Design a protein around this ligand. Structure first.
Ligand code: CLA
Ligand code: CLA
Ligand code: CLA
Ligand code: CLA
Ligand code: CLA
Ligand code: CLA
Ligand code: CLA
Ligand code: CLA
Ligand SMILES: CCCCCCCCCCCCCCCCCC(=O)OC[C@H](CO[C@@H]1O[C@H](CO)[C@H](O)[C@H](O)[C@H]1O)OC(=O)CCCCCCCCCCCCCCCCC
Ligand SMILES: CC1=C(/C=C/C(C)=C/C=C/C(C)=C/C=C/C=C(C)/C=C/C=C(C)/C=C/C2=C(C)CCCC2(C)C)C(C)(C)CCC1
Ligand code: SF4
Ligand code: SF4
Lengths: 131, 119, 663, 86, 73, 79, 218
C-alpha cells in the first residue's frame, strides 16, 4: 500500500467531518464560542428548527398567543386613535401655541402604535411555537 | 499697549520652531542608531524578543500562540479521531492517525521568521 | 545585516498600526494601547480648544468684536515672524501697532452665542480645559495601571480547574464590552450631555442675551422656528428646547441593552442574530468603519445646517465664516466617508471569517455572492451620470459659444422643486398657525434652477464613482479573478508582477488610493457649487448650465483680488493667501512625479548618486553607505507620498481662493 | 527575504526554475504529476522578488507564489550593489 | 476501468480560484495513474491572462456538464 | 492695515484692536505652569505607550494585583 | 563536489584566468563592499560575450574567472554562457574573510534538471486557494502570515470554520466564577488527572442546567 492522493483526500474528509462535530461540543473552548459571540446564551436559545423560539420576545415568552393578540389589537386601536386625534382631528398645535398644554393622553397613546406592531409580531411568534 | 505680549513671542517662536525642532531631529537621528530603534515595527530587535518571552512567561499566555490551543482533553479528541479513521481506513492502509498528524504538522519552511537570529 | 533608507518610510507607514506591532501578542495589549491612544488624543483635543481660547483671550479683540460684531472682524492671533520688514508697516498691522490675523474659524460667534462676555471668562475657560487635559492624561495612566494590576492579579489567580485559561478572553472585557458601552454612550454621553447643555443655555446663554427675566422659567422652552430677526440666528430658547428633547429621547433609548445587570435589557448579539446582520462585532476595524460612517452624515449635516440655519449670533453677517465653515466640514466628512470604506476593506482583509464556499449566512457572504452584480450596476449608473452630465454640459457650452443661449438643453429641476414646494407648504402652514408669525428660515429652501440640476447630477456622479472604487476594493480585497489569493497578502502591497497581463494598483489599498482622487474631485465639485451660489446667486442661476461659465465667471473672474495680493505695486492683507496659493500649487504639482514616475527610474538614479558619494574623496573615507543605505521609495510608499502631495495641494489651494473671493 | 512557496498543482514545467535570475528555485523528484517532478525554493534568501517565476508558470493559478515582505528586506532581496550589509 | 470523465466530454470547473470557475471545457485526457493528484486535463475556448487555454484539474473539480450552447460560456 | 478683497473695501469692514494688553504676564505664567504639567504628564504617557505593558511584573513587582469588584461582575456578566 | 580555492579579488591582481574585458565603472564598488561573487568556467574558443556590468569581453581558451558584486550578475553571465553551450560553470560567494561558498550548481546538477536527494522545500500540499484565512490565525504563530501555516493548522481552522456555522448546536462557554475561585496559586489540589474528571462533571452540570432552563418556555 502507498498513500494515493485519493487516500489523502479521504483522510482530509474524515478529519474534517470528525473535528467539525467535535469543536461544537463542550471540549474546544474557542473565543468565538463565548457568550456574546456566535453561540446562543445558555438558557435563552433564540432560533431553533428554523423558527423564532419563545425566548426571543424576552419577558413576553410566558404570554399566551391570545393575550398577545388582544394586546396587539388594543394597542393598535389606541395608538392609531392617538395619532389621528393629535395630527388631523382635534389638532393640539394651535392650543399649545397660545400658551396651552398638550393633551397628555394623546401623547401617551400615540406611542402605542409601534408597540402594537412589535406586539403583533410577538403574537405570531408565540402562535408558531404553540404557546 | 496692545503689544507687550511679543516679549513672550520673541522667546517662544524661535525656541519652539528652531531650537526644539533641531534638537528633535538630532535626537531622532541619534535614536535611529540604537539597537532598540523602532522595535515595534522593525523585525529582529532585542526588545521584541524580550517582550514575546515575557508574554510567554505569563501563566495565561503560555500556550497562546498555538493555533490548536483550546482542546480541553486532547487525548479524548485524538482517540475519537483514531476511532473514526479506523472505520473509514481504506482497505489495508498502513497510515495511522498519530503519524499522519505528526507529518501534517511538520512542514519545511526554513525561511520563515529567520530574522529571529540576530538580536 | 541592517536596514536601508526605506526603513523610515516603512515604519512611519504603519506607525499607528497597533495590530502590526511586534511586541503585541493578544487583544489585551491591542485594546489597552488603543484606549491609551484615545486618552492621549482627547488630551490633544482639549489642548487645542484651550489654545484657541487662550489666543482669543490674549492676542485678540473679543472684548471689542462683541460690541459691534456686524462690521468688525475678529483676530486669530498675532504675527511674530522675523522675516517681515523691520521697517515701514506690514499690511497686517495698523502702522506701529502689532501684526494680526483675521480669524476665519468661527469661534467668536460660538463663544458669543454660548454666553461669553468678558476676556476673563475665556481665560478661566482656557485654564479649565488645560486642567481637563491633565485629567485625561492621568486617566490614561490610571487605566494602564489598573489593567497591569489585573495582569499582576493573575499571579494570585487560578480556577483550580483546567478552565482557568478561559480568563484569557475576559482580561479586556473593560474595553471590548459592547452592551455597556452602547447603553452608557447613548444615555449619558448623548442624552445627558444634551440635557446638561440645555441647563447651560437656560442658566447662562439665554440670561446673557436679553433683558433680565424670570428665574429661568419653563417659558425659556419655545417652539418658534428659525432665524431670530435681530441676530439672524436660531432662537436660543429653541436651541435649549431642541437639546432638551434630544436628551430626553436619547436618555430613554439608553436603557435598551443589558449593561450592568443580567436581568435588564436585551443583548446586542441577540438583536443582531434575529435580523439581517449578525456581523463579527468583535472586530475593531468593523466598529471603526461603521462609526466613521456615522460621523460622516453628522459632519455633512453640520456643514449643511450651519449655513442653512445659522445657529450662532451674527454668523450669517460674516461673508467668510459661512463659506469657510461649510467647506471645512464638507472636507472633514468626505475624509470620514472614505475612511469608513477603507476600514471596511481592512475589516474584510484582516478581521472577517467566512464559511467554506456556499453557506450564505453572513451578510458579507451574501454581498460577496453577487458582488459582480453590485459592481456592474454601480459602473452602469456611474457611466450614465457621467455621459449625460458631460454631454449636456458640452451641448450648452457649444450652443452658447455659437451665440445661441436659447438652444441649450435646460431640464427644469422638477423633482427637487416638488420636494421644496412640499416642505415650503408645510413650513408656511406651521407659520400661518402662529400668533407670532413672519418668521424666516434663511437658506433651508433655495432657488433651484437647471444649473442646480446639472450640478446635482455631477455630485451624484462623483459620489457614485467614489463608492464604486471603494466598494470594489472592499469586495475584491479578499480575491478577484485577476489575483485569486489577495487575502493572503497585506492590505497594501506593491503589485503582482508584470506577468499575467500586468498588475499595477492591484491591492485594496490601491483601490483606496484611486478613490481618494475621486473623493477630492467630488468635494471640489460640492464646494465649487456652494461657493459659486454664495458669491452671486443670480449669475449662477442664469449662467451656470455651461461649463465655460464655471471656468470664466467663477474661477478666472473671482481670482482677481488674490493674485493682486503681493505684486510690484504693494501688498494687501491677502499676501499670505497668494503666497500659500502658489505654494499649494507647487505642492500639488510636486506629487505628480511620485504618481507618474515610478520606482525603477529613481532607483537607478539613486544608484548613480550613491556611486558619486562613494567616489568623492572625503565622503568615501567616512561613509560607505553600509549603515543607512539610500534607496528609492518603495512602490506603495511612492503612491502614498504622491497622494499626500496631491491631496494637500488640492485641499490647501482652496482656502486662499475662498478668502480672496469672499473677504 | 521574501517567501516563495510551491503548491501541489505544479506539473514540473521547469519554466519557473529557468526564469529565476538568482537560482532560487530547483527541481525535486515527486510523484504527484505525470512529470514525476515538482519545483522547490531552497534558497529564497536570494529571491529578489522579480516574480518572473510567476510569469512563467502555466497552471490555472500559479503553482509557485511569491509573497513580498518589504519590512523584511535583506541585502540580497534588495539587489544592493554599491553597498554591502556584511 | 476508466476513471474520471470521458475524453471529449464537457465538464464544469469547480476550482474557485480557476480563471474558468463555473465555466465549461472539453476534457483532453485523464491521467490513469492513481498517484496523480490533478489528472484531468481540460481545454477551454477562452484563454486566461497568461494566454493559456488548457489546465490540469483534480478529479473532484469537474462535474461533467452538458455542451455550452449558443452564446453561453 | 491695508485691506484686500472687494467686500472689505466696499463695505468698510474694519478690524478693531484693543488698546489694552489682553492678559497680564501673571495670567500667561499661570497658564504656562499647567501647560508644563500637561507636558510632563504627556512625556510620561508617551514613554509608557512606547514601552507597552510588562506582563513579567508578577515575578518582580510587589503586591498581588487587584481586580475591582465591579470588574469581576463585568467579567462574569458576559461580553 | 569540491569547492575551488577562489582567492579574494583584492589579492589576485593580474591573473591569467581573467578574460580580456574592456572594464567599466559598472564593476563591483570597492572601498565600500567586501562581499564578492565569483564565476568560473572552462571554454573551448575565445568567443566574445557581454559582461553583466557593461562592456564586452573575450573568454580564454582554457580556464576563466570573473568577480561580481551580486549573485544576480553571476547568474546572468551563467545563462549567457549556457546559451553558448558552455556547461561546467560554477558560481561562488566570497565572504569578507575569504570563505568560499559554492552556490549555483549546488549539487553539481543544474536546478532545471531533476537530481536525486533533493526535497521540496517550501512546498504546500494543496492548491493555492487552500491556504487558511488570515482572519482565523490572528495573534497565533501566523498572525499576518496565513500562507506559512502548516497543513495541519489549515485543516484545523477549516474544520473550525465548518463547525462555527451551525450556531444552534454550539456550546456557549460558561462564565468563570471570579469572586469565589481565584485563590493564591499555591492553593491548588494537584491531582491533574482528577482535574479533567472535575472538568467532565462540572461541564455535565452546566449542560444539564442549561437544558433544564431551556425546557421552561421553549
Ligand atoms: C512642480 C513639481 C515638480 C518639482 C518641484 C520637481 C522637482 C524635481 N524633479 Mg520632477 N517631475 C515632476 C514634477 C516636479 N518635479 C513631474 C510631474 C514629472 C513627471 C513624471 C517629473 C519627472 C521627473 C524626472 C523624470 C526627473 C525629475 C527630476 C527632478 C529634480 C531635478 C530638479 C532639481 O533638482 O531641482 C531642485 C528641486 C526643486 C524643487 C527646486 C526648488 C527647490 C526649493 C525651491 C529650494 C529649497 C527650499 C528650501 C530648502 C526649503 C527647505 C524645506 C523646508 C522644510 C525647510 C527635482 C527634484 C530629475 C532628477 O531628479 O534629476 C536630478 C529627473 O530625472 N522629475
Ligand atoms: C422599538 C424596538 C424595540 C423592540 C422590538 C423591543 C423588544 C423587546 N425588549 Mg426592548 N427596549 C426598547 C425598544 C425595543 N424593545 C427601547 C427603546 C428601550 C429603552 C427604554 C428598551 C428597553 C428594554 C429593557 C430594559 C428590556 C427590554 C426587553 C425587551 C424584550 C421583552 C419585551 C417586553 O417585555 O417589553 C414590554 C423584547 C425582545 C426586556 C428583555 O427581554 O430583556 C432581556 C428588558 O429587560 N427592552
Ligand atoms: C522664508 C520663508 C518663511 C519662513 C521661514 C517663515 C517663518 C515663519 N512664519 Mg511666515 N510668512 C512668509 C515667509 C516665511 N515665514 C511669507 C512670504 C508670508 C506672507 C507675507 C508669511 C506670513 C506669515 C503669517 C501670516 C504668519 C507667519 C508665521 C511664521 C512663523 C510660524 C512658525 C511656526 O509656528 O511653525 C509651525 C510650522 C508648521 C505647523 C508646519 C509643519 C510642516 C515662522 C517664524 C506665523 C507667526 O507669526 O507665528 C507666531 C503667522 O501667523 N508667516
Ligand atoms: C505657522 C504656523 C501656525 C500655527 C501653529 C497657527 C496656529 C493657529 N491658528 Mg493660524 N495661521 C497661520 C499660521 C499658523 N497658525 C498663517 C500663516 C495664516 C495665514 C493663512 C493663519 C491663519 C489663521 C486663521 C484665519 C485662523 C487661524 C487660527 C489658528 C488657531 C487654530 C488652528 C488653526 O486654524 O490653524 C490654521 C493654520 C493655518 C491656516 C496655516 C497653517 C497650515 C499648515 C502649515 C498646513 C497643515 C499642517 C498639518 C495639518 C499639521 C491656532 C492658534 C484660527 C483661530 O480661530 O485662532 C484663534 C483661525 O480662524 N490661523
Ligand atoms: C479635524 C477635526 C475637526 C476640526 C478641527 C473642527 C473644527 C471646527 N468645528 Mg467641527 N466637527 C468635526 C470635526 C472637526 N471640526 C466632526 C467630525 C464633527 C461631527 C461630530 C463636527 C461637528 C461640529 C459642530 C456640530 C460644530 C463644529 C464647530 C466647529 C468650529 C468651532 C469649534 C470650536 O472651536 O468650539 C470650541 C471649528 C471650525 C462649531 C461651529 O460651526 O462653530 C462656528 C459647531 O457648531 N463642529
Ligand atoms: C453587443 C453589444 C453590447 C451590448 C448588448 C452591451 C450590453 C450591456 N453593457 Mg456593454 N459594452 C459594449 C458592448 C455591448 N454592451 C462594448 C463594445 C463596450 C466597450 C466600450 C462595453 C462596455 C460596457 C461597460 C463599461 C458597461 C457596460 C454595461 C452593459 C450593460 C448595461 C447597458 C449599458 O451600460 O449599455 C451602455 C453601453 C456602453 C456604454 C458601451 C458602448 C456601447 C457599444 C459601443 C455598442 C457596440 C455594439 C456593437 C457595435 C453592435 C454591432 C452589431 C453588428 C456586428 C451586427 C448591458 C448588459 C454596464 C454594465 O455592466 O451594467 C450592467 C457597464 O458598466 N458595457
Ligand atoms: C478629466 C478627468 C477625468 C475624466 C473625464 C474621467 C472619466 C472617467 N473616470 Mg476617471 N479618473 C481620473 C480623471 C478622469 N476620469 C483621475 C485623475 C483618476 C485618478 C487615478 C481617476 C480614477 C478613476 C477610477 C478609479 C474610476 C474612474 C472612472 C471613470 C469613469 C466614470 C464613469 C463616467 O462618467 O463615464 C463617462 C465617460 C466620460 C465622461 C468620458 C467622456 C466620453 C466621451 C468623451 C463622451 C469615466 C470614464 C470609474 C469608472 O470606470 O466608471 C465606470 C472608476 O472606476 N476614474
Ligand atoms: C442613473 C440615473 C439617474 C440618477 C442617479 C439621477 C440622480 C438624480 N436626479 Mg435625475 N434624471 C434621470 C436619471 C438619473 N438621475 C433621467 C433619465 C431624467 C430624465 C431626463 C432625470 C430627471 C431629473 C429631474 C427633472 C430631477 C432629477 C433630480 C435628481 C437628483 C435627485 C434625485 C431624484 O429625484 O432623482 C429621481 C430619480 C430618478 C430619475 C431615477 C431614474 C433612473 C432611471 C433608470 C433613468 C432612466 C429612466 C428612463 C430614461 C425613462 C424613460 C421613459 C420612456 C420609456 C418614456 C439626483 C442627483 C432632481 C434634482 O437634482 O433637482 C435638484 C430633479 O429635479 N432628475
Ligand atoms: C491636508 C492633508 C491631507 C492629506 C493626507 C491624506 C493622506 C491620506 C491618509 C492615508 C494614511 C493611511 C495610509 C497609510 O498610512 O499607509 C500608506 C502606506 C502603508 O505602508 C505600506 O503598508 C503595507 C502594509 O499594510 C506594506 O508594509 C507596504 O510595504 C508599506 O509601504 O504608508 C507608507 O507607505 C508611508 C510612506 C510615507 C511616510 C511618510 C512619513 C510621514 C512623515 C510626515 C508626518
Ligand atoms: C517653574 C515655574 C515657571 C516656569 C514654567 C515653565 C518653564 C513653563 C513651560 C511650559 C511649557 C514649555 C509647556 C509646554 C507644553 C507643551 C504641551 C502641553 C504639549 C502637549 C502635547 C500633548 C499633550 C500631546 C502629546 C502626545 C503626542 C503628540 C505624542 C503621542 C502621545 C501624546 C498623545 C501624549 C514660572 C516661573 C513661569 C512660574 C512658576 C513655576
Ligand atoms: S512553472 Fe509552475 S507548474 Fe511549471 S514547474 Fe515551475 S512551479 Fe511547477
Ligand atoms: S521572484 Fe524572481 S528571484 Fe524570486 S524565485 Fe521568482 S523568479 Fe526567482
Amino acid at each position: 500500500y502507498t498513500e494515493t492522493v485519493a487516500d489523502e483526500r479521504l483522510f482530509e474528509q474524515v478529519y474534517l467531518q470528525y473535528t467539525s462535530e467535535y469543536l461544537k461540543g463542550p471540549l474546544y473552548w474557542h473565543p468565538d464560542k463565548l457568550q456574546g459571540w456566535l453561540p446562543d446564551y445558555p438558557g435563552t436559545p433564540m432560533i431553533k428548527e428554523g423558527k423564532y423560539t419563545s425566548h426571543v420576545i424576552g419577558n413576553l415568552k410566558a404570554f399566551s398567543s391570545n393575550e398577545l393578540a388582544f394586546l396587539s389589537m388594543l394597542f393598535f386601536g389606541v395608538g392609531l386613535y392617538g395619532n389621528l386625534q393629535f395630527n388631523f382631528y382635534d389638532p393640539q398645535w394651535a392650543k399649545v401655541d397660545a400658551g396651552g398644554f398638550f393633551n397628555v393622553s394623546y401623547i401617551v397613546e400615540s406611542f402605542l402604535l409601534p408597540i402594537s406592531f412589535f406586539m403583533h409580531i410577538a403574537c405570531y411568534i408565540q402562535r408558531q411555537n404553540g404557546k | 499697549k496692545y503689544g507687550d505680549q511679543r516679549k513672550f513671542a520673541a522667546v517662544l517662536v524661535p525656541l519652539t520652531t528652531l531650537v526644539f525642532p533641531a534638537v528633535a531631529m538630532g535626537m531622532f537621528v541619534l535614536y535611529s542608531f540604537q539597537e532598540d530603534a523602532f522595535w515595534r515595527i522593525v523585525p529582529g530587535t532585542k526588545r521584541a524578543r524580550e517582550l514575546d518571552e515575557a508574554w510567554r512567561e505569563h501563566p495565561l499566555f503560555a500556550n497562546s500562540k498555538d493555533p490548536l490551543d483550546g482542546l480541553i482533553n486532547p487525548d479524548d479528541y485524538e482517540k475519537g479521531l483514531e476511532e473514526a479513521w479506523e472505520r473509514a481506513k481504506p482497505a489495508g492502509s498502513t497510515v495511522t492517525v498519530k503519524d499522519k498528524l505528526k507529518q501534517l504538522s511538520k512542514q519545511n519552511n526554513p525561511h520563515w521568521e529567520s530574522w529571529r537570529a540576530m538580536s | 545585516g541592517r536596514c536601508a533608507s526605506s526603513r523610515y518610510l516603512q515604519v512611519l507607514g504603519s506607525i499607528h498600526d497597533i495590530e502590526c506591532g511586534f511586541g503585541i501578542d493578544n487583544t489585551l495589549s491591542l485594546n489597552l494601547q488603543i484606549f491609551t491612544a484615545h486618552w492621549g488624543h482627547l488630551t490633544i483635543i482639549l489642548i487645542w480648544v484651550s489654545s484657541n481660547l487662550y489666543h482669543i483671550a490674549s492676542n485678540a479683540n473679543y472684548s471689542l468684536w462683541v460690541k459691534n460684531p456686524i462690521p468688525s472682524m475678529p483676530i486669530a492671533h498675532n504675527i511674530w515672524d522675523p522675516h517681515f520688514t523691520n521697517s515701514t508697516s506690514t499690511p497686517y498691522s495698523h502702522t506701529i501697532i502689532t501684526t494680526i490675523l483675521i480669524a476665519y474659524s468661527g469661534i467668536y460667534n460660538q463663544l458669543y452665542t454660548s454666553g461669553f462676555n468678558t476676556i476673563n471668562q475665556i481665560y478661566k475657560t482656557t485654564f479649565t480645559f488645560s486642567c481637563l487635559a491633565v485629567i485625561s492624561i492621568l486617566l490614561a495612566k490610571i487605566h494602564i495601571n489598573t489593567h497591569s494590576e489585573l495582569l499582576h492579579k493573575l499571579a494570585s489567580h487560578t480556577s483550580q480547574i483546567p478552565s482557568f485559561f478561559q480568563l484569557l478572553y475576559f482580561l479586556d472585557v473593560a474595553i471590548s464590552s459592547v452592551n455597556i458601552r452602547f447603553n452608557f454612550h447613548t444615555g449619558i454621553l448623548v442624552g445627558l450631555f444634551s440635557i446638561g447643555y440645555t441647563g447651560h443655555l437656560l442658566d447662562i446663554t439665554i440670561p446673557a442675551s436679553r433683558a433680565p427675566l424670570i428665574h429661568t422659567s419653563p417659558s425659556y422652552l419655545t417652539f418658534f422656528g428659525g432665524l431670530k430677526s435681530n441676530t439672524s440666528s436660531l432662537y436660543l430658547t429653541d436651541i435649549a428646547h431642541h437639546h432638551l428633547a434630544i436628551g430626553i429621547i436619547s436618555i430613554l433609548t439608553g436603557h435598551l441593552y443589558s449593561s450592568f445587570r443580567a436581568a435588564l435589557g436585551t443583548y446586542i448579539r441577540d438583536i443582531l442574530y434575529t435580523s439581517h446582520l449578525t456581523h463579527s462585532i468583535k472586530s475593531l476595524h468593523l466598529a471603526l468603519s461603521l462609526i466613521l460612517a456615522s460621523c460622516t452624515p453628522l459632519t455633512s449635516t453640520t456643514a449643511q445646517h450651519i449655513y442653512s440655519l445659522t445657529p450662532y449670533f451674527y454668523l450669517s453677517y460674516d461673508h467668510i465664516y459661512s463659506t469657510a465653515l461649510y467647506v471645512h466640514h464638507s472636507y472633514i466628512t468626505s475624509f470620514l466617508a472614505i475612511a469608513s470604506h477603507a476600514h471596511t476593506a481592512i475589516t474584510l482583509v484582516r478581521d472577517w471569517v467566512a464559511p467554506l464556499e456556499q453557506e450564505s449566512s453572513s451578510k458579507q457572504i451574501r454581498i460577496h455572492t453577487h458582488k459582480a452584480a453590485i459592481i456592474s450596476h454601480l459602473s452602469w449608473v456611474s457611466l450614465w451620470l457621467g455621459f449625460h452630465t458631460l454631454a449636456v454640459y458640452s451641448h450648452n457650452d457649444t450652443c452658447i459659444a455659437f451665440n445661441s443661449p436659447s438652444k441649450q438643453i435646460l431640464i427644469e429641476a422638477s423633482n427637487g422643486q416638488l420636494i421644496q414646494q412640499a416642505s415650503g407648504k408645510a413650513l408656511y402652514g406651521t407659520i400661518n398657525s402662529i400668533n407670532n408669525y413672519n418668521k424666516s428660515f434663511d437658506s433651508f429652501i433655495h432657488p433651484i434652477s437647471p444649473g442646480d440640476l446639472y450640478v446635482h447630477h455631477a455630485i451624484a456622479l462623483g459620489l457614485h464613482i467614489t463608492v464604486l472604487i471603494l466598494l470594489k476594493g472592499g469586495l475584491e480585497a479578499r480575491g478577484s479573478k485577476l489575483m485569486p489569493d489577495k487575502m493572503e497578502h497585506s492590505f497594501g502591497f506593491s503589485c503582482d508582477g508584470p506577468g499575467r497581463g500586468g498588475t499595477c494598483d492591484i491591492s485594496a489599498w490601491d483601490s483606496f488610493y484611486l478613490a481618494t482622487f475621486w473623493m477630492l474631485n467630488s468635494n471640489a465639485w460640492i464646494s465649487f457649487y456652494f461657493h459659486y451660489k454664495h458669491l452671486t446667486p443670480r449669475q449662477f442661476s442664469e449662467s451656470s448650465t455651461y461649463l465655460e461659465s464655471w471656468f470664466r465667471d467663477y474661477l478666472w473672474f473671482n481670482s482677481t483680488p488674490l493674485i493682486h495680493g503681493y505684486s510690484t505695486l504693494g501688498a494687501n492683507d491677502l499676501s499670505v493667501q497668494s503666497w500659500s496659493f502658489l505654494l499649494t500649487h507647487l505642492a500639488w504639482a510636486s506629487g505628480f512625479m511620485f504618481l507618474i514616475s515610478w520606482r525603477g527610474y529613481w532607483q537607478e538614479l539613486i544608484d548613480i548618486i550613491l556611486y558619486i558619494h562613494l567616489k568623492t574623496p572625503i565622503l568615501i573615507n567616512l561613509w560607505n553607505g553600509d549603515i543607512y543605505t539610500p534607496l528609492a521609495l518603495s512602490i506603495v510608499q511612492a503612491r502614498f507620498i504622491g497622494l499626500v502631495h496631491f491631496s494637500t495641494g488640492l485641499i490647501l489651494t482652496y482656502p486662499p481662493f475662498i478668502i480672496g473671493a469672499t473677504s | 527575504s521574501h517567501a516563495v512557496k510551491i503548491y501541489d498543482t505544479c506539473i514540473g514545467c521547469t519554466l519557473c526554475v529557468r526564469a529565476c535570475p538568482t537560482d532560487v528555485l530547483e527541481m525535486v523528484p515527486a510523484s504527484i504529476n505525470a512529470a514525476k517532478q515538482v519545483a522547490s525554493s531552497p534558497r529564497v534568501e536570494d529571491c529578489v522578488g522579480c516574480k518572473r517565476c510567476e510569469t512563467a508558470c502555466p497552471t490555472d493559478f500559479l503553482s509557485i507564489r511569491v509573497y513580498l515582505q518589504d519590512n523584511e528586506e535583506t541585502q540580497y532581496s534588495l539587489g544592493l550593489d554599491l553597498v554591502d550589509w556584511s | 476501468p476508466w476513471v474520471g470523465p470521458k475524453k471529449g466530454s464537457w465538464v464544469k470547473i469547480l476550482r474557485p480560484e480557476s480563471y474558468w470557475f463555473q465555466q465549461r471545457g472539453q476534457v483532453v485526457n485523464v491521467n490513469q495513474k492513481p498517484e496523480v493528484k490533478y489528472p484531468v486535463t481540460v481545454k477551454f475556448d477562452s484563454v486566461n491572462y497568461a494566454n493559456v487555454n488548457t489546465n490540469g484539474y483534480a478529479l473532484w473539480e469537474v462535474i461533467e456538464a452538458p455542451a455550452p450552447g449558443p452564446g453561453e460560456v | 492695515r491695508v485691506p484686500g478683497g472687494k467686500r472689505t473695501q466696499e463695505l468698510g469692514l474694519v478690524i478693531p484692536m484693543a488698546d489694552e494688553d489682553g492678559l497680564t504676564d501673571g495670567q500667561v505664567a499661570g497658564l504656562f505652569v499647567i501647560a508644563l504639567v500637561v507636558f510632563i504628564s504627556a512625556m510620561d504617557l508617551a514613554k509608557t505607550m512606547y514601552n507597552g505593558i510588562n506582563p513579567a511584573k508578577f515575578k518582580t513587582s510587589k503586591g498581588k494585583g487587584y481586580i475591582s469588584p465591579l470588574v469581576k461582575r463585568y467579567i462574569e456578566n458576559g461580553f | 563536489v569540491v569547492a575551488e580555492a577562489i582567492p579574494r579579488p583584492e589579492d589576485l591582481l593580474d591573473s591569467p584566468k581573467f578574460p580580456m574585458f574592456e572594464g567599466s565603472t559598472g564593476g563591483y564598488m570597492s572601498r565600500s563592499t567586501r562581499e564578492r561573487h565569483a564565476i568560473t568556467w572552462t571554454a573551448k574558443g575565445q568567443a566574445k560575450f557581454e559582461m553583466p556590468t557593461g562592456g564586452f569581453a573575450i573568454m580564454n581558451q582554457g580556464e576563466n574567472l570573473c568577480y561580481f558584486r551580486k549573485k544576480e550578475q553571476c547568474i546572468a553571465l551563467g545563462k549567457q554562457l549556457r546559451k553558448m553551450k558552455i556547461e561546467n560553470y560554477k558560481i561562488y560567494r566570497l565572504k569578507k574573510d575569504g570563505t568560499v561558498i559554492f552556490m549555483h550548481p549546488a549539487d553539481g546538477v543544474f536546478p532545471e534538471k531533476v537530481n536525486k536527494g533533493r526535497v521540496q522545500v517550501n512546498g504546500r500540499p494543496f492548491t493555492i486557494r487552500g491556504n487558511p484565512q488570515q482572519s482565523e490565525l490572528k495573534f497565533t504563530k501566523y498572525q499576518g502570515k496565513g500562507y506559512e501555516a502548516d497543513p495541519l493548522t489549515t485543516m484545523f481552522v477549516k474544520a473550525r470554520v465548518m463547525a462555527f456555522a451551525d450556531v444552534p448546536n454550539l456550546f456557549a462557554l460558561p462564565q468563570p466564577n471570579m469572586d469565589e475561585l481565584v485563590p493564591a496559586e499555591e492553593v491548588d489540589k494537584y491531582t491533574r488527572q482528577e482535574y479533567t474528571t472535575r472538568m467532565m462533571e462540572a461541564l455535565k452540570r452546566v449542560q444539564d442546567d442549561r437544558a433544564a432552563k431551556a425546557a421552561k418556555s421553549l
